[PDB]
């Protein structure tokens, strides 16, 4: 009941609809703390086998702390604009370097592992304690001091309790202090769920985020922030989905050319506005780089930093490309090469020249042969399409597709006065150039 598709023969493009939106509009920052110990070199000049292992595990811990201390020391995608991804978390850490902000956090978390702390600038952030190495080292490892270990399971327990810090240090070291995909070492799944549960958002947003934690991880940041006194702190910057559950639709385009027998003398045309389209508030967000949108079943996650704001009239380009309300963007060329585009529920085949183009399924083999021009085939009884030397697999999603017939628009142009090398043109701009060229030729 969800996904449908339509192919337009006039323009050689297809539209997929039936998807739902989840657009990241803002950021949410939280502070994660780890309590450290102040172990100083002990004498304990033993020779036991377990003492040596304990010493090695303490050396690893101290080297990790030193390394962390050293870490902090004093088409159409060209129209988008550039932002700064981690500005908010960096601002939070810039605040945390102030005089009493670490003390405030330390004194507000001693009784509980979660709390809301008001910073000196008035902003209140979630602070959450994930690991307590101070307690296990000060007590139960240096009892008031275990200089001759009598149990082997002490070594194993200490090794288990130390892996988290080493893994975090490694991840921060190989990334210069900023890890885009937030690993389960930085935040476990239970901790991430507990953190989502405390955001001041609606229950619908919480349900959307709780069922897609793998996307939330993929769209998050972790920033190494500070390590002073006996506290390790880093900021986690989570996505905020301000717009959810609105209709979304994808556009696929392929070149459209004439089919003259002579090798040259052929003109081509292509729509350049392929991408994802979602309507949020009385307008449409357009994402030219469809690689920047994650898809889970019929839910699309897109980032507004990589979008343009367009009027709702843009949708008229699919129904009629010559409408006066909106000017559709195209590209003209003179090189006709065969290729294929795999859509949501089928494939578009532009087969030109002397290439051999076919569609097949596993049981019966070839079940269609394509002629020169642009054509479409549904995935209902087709498994693969082969264009020249290339073989493609079609998606096997369930849905209905519709074929719309019409005369290709490249036949309405006169090749004599047709512009060719136009990368960033449109319908009106091509018409103006054609009109000027045609009006010039009236000499007498």
């Amino acid at each position: 009941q969800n996904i449908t598709e339509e192919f337009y023969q006039s323009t050689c493009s297809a539209v997929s609809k039936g998807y739902l939106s989840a657009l990241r509009t803002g950021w949410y920052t939280s502070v994660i703390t780890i309590e450290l110990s102040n172990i100083k070199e002990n004498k304990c000049n033993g020779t036991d086998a377990k003492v040596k292992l304990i010493k090695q595990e303490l050396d690893k811990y101290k080297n990790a702390v030193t390394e962390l201390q050293l870490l902090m020391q004093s088409f159409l995608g060209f129209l988008l604009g550039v932002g700064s991804a981690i500005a908010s978390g960096v601002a939070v850490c810039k605040v945390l370097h102030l005089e009493g902000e670490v003390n405030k956090i330390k004194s507000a978390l001693l009784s509980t592992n979660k709390a809301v702390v008001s910073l000196s600038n008035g902003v209140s952030v979630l602070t959450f304690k994930v690991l307590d190495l101070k307690n296990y080292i000060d007590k139960q490892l240096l009892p008031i001091q275990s200089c001759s270990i009598s149990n082997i399971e002490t070594v194993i327990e200490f090794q288990q309790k130390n892996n988290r810090l080493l893994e975090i240090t490694r991840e921060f070291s190989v990334n210069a202090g900023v890890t885009t995909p937030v690993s389960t070492y930085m935040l476990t799944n239970s901790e991430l769920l507990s953190l989502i549960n405390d955001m001041p958002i609606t229950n619908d947003q919480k349900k959307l985020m709780s069922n897609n934690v793998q996307i939330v991880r993929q769209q998050s940041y972790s920033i190494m922030c500070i390590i002073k006194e006996e506290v390790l702190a880093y900021v986690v910057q989570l996505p905020l989905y301000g717009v959810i559950d609105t209709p979304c639709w994808k556009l696929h385009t392929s070149p459209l050319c004439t089919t003259n027998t002579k090798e040259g003398s052929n003109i081509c045309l292509t729509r350049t506005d392929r991408g994802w389209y979602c309507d949020n508030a009385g307008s449409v967000s357009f994402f030219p780089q469809a690689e920047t949108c994650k898809v889970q079943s019929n839910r699309v996650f897109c980032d507004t930093m990589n979008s343009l704001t367009l009027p709702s009239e843009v949708n008229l380009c699919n129904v009629d490309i010559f409408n006066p309300k909106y000017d559709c963007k195209i590209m003209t060329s003179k090189t006709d090469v065969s290729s294929s585009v795999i859509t949501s529920l089928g494939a578009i085949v532009s087969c030109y020249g002397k290439t051999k183009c076919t569609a097949s399924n596993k049981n019966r083999g070839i079940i269609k042969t394509f002629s020169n021009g642009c054509d479409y085939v549904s995935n209902k009884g087709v498994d693969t399409v082969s264009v020249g030397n290339t073989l493609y697999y079609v998606n096997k999603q369930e849905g209905k597709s519709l074929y719309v017939k019409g005369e290709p628009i490249i036949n309405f142009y006169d090749p004599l006065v047709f512009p060719s090398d136009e990368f960033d043109a449109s319908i009106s701009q091509v018409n103006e150039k054609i009109n000027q060229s045609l009006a010039f030729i009236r000499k007498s």
Partner: antibody
Amino acid sequence: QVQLVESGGGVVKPGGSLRVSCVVSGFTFSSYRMHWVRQAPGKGLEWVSSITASSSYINYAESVKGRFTISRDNAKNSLYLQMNSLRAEDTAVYYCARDENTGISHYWFDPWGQGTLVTVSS
Amino acid sequence: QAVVTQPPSVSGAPGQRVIISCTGSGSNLGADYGVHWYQQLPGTAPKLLIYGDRNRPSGVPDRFSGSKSGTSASLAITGLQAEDEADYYCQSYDRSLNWVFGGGTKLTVLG
């Protein structure tokens, strides 16, 4: 100009059924969450039910769970409330309202309808 | 989980300044959810007076202002007139009860 027009109110006996409707115009109906709010005669306001732009998430008040059902039709720009097993305390004026929000903390109802009175009397 | 409380009634004299208060708990206003105010006339429908704790839509005569802090919010009216006799509501969001509304405060002007 944005307009929300409610209809379908009337008298009914306890344990009966009724269906109210609200037709909107002046904005994209499919980009917004919609709500139902009722007010008893001489009493305060009470939120009833909400529905997201594509029917994915639905919420009810604890006093109407299991008896009311919210739905919408995006093609006709209308949303519906089906009331079943009516009780005496369901007498009130029912409003349809559009959701406004800032993404994180603020959520309010800026545009309201005119209301439709529903009376449950034996 | 929580509830929102409002003074049943308030009175004032023309030209004076009255204050309406809204008191929440740790699940509505202690959970960082904003407060919003609505004005209702004797036979009309509610209309928005203040959103975002302090914001005013286009058409409110700038005589209404609100503020929030902790689990308390207030609406202040200066220059009381005879057209201000109306019911006033505060609404927020709750973790368990979702959208919640105050009890309602009816303003009276003496004279």
